[PDB]
Design a protein around this ligand. Structure first.
Ligand SMILES: O=c1[nH]cnc2c(CNCCCP(=O)(O)O)c[nH]c12
Lengths: 148, 147
């Protein structure tokens, strides 16, 4: 069927620097992050430490219900929503919808490492077109290590 | 003196943490990530255990616990994860609010590092905390940029 793409820790570090650069071009350094769990956790960890951001919020998604919706402090105006891949785009669109409804005065930008060209909804910042089959080091490294 | 905690060491430690946690409470039913320190660790653990119920909580310094999660009713065995226990003050305050808000659930804590003189200790930890540790999620990205 489809060929097997893999995203390593070293590629993640290189791309994260480029992601930082592109986010700063579009909205400056964010004042807070919303991590889409689980996919965005490692990325948002690295980004929040790089930008010295202590305001890091989480949000979950499942025909979609968005769960654990954060309540962002009033003085935070520029928020970056972070996920690792946008496939159909349905989850990210729903996440941004509930976040902006709840906080109409704030500006939410979205960033993803990978982005399907066919997605109905695209992140404001993304680095790479998503192939049909790609796995990530946070998914596969532990078990190959356990297998050895 | 200065320890760089690498991605490779973190992988090996994460498997051992899984083993130690399962010995104590079995496989957890959900995770609470202490942000930011527990983020990457909770990401790897939740994927390893195939757990989608992952919650965040914030401990910011003086000390305030913020963004207290509402854990669903059917989840009873919860693992709270952070990367290092120093004084133990922030983990102790996280557990107290979680237990206060969910008196029906059992919360266990796990850390990679724990300093021996900590006033409050995690249920499960792997290594004594040395004088200072650079974690790869803290330094690798600025080091790559600057070299
Ligand atoms: O060597 C270290 N590297 C990175 N971070 C730390 C910290 C702060 N986080 C620990 C939890 C705060 P506490 O409430 O337990 O005191 C202490 N030492 C180190």
């Amino acid at each position: 069927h489809h060929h097997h793409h893999h995203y390593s820790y070293e590629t993640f570090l290189k791309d994260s620097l480029e992601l930082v650069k592109q986010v700063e071009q579009i909205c400056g350094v964010p004042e807070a992050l919303v991590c889409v769990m689980r996919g965005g956790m490692t990325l948002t960890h690295f980004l929040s430490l790089h930008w010295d951001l202590r305001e890091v919020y989480g949000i979950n998604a499942i025909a979609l219900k968005i769960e654990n919706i954060p309540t962002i402090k009033d003085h935070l105006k520029t928020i970056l929503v972070v996920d690792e891949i946008v496939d159909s785009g349905n989850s990210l669109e729903a996440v941004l919808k509930v976040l902006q409804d709840k906080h109409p005065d704030k500006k939410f930008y979205s960033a993803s490492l990978f982005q399907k060209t066919s997605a109905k909804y695209k992140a404001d910042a993304f680095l790479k077109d998503a192939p049909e089959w790609i796995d990530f080091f946070w998914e596969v490294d532990l078990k190959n290590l356990k297998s050895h």
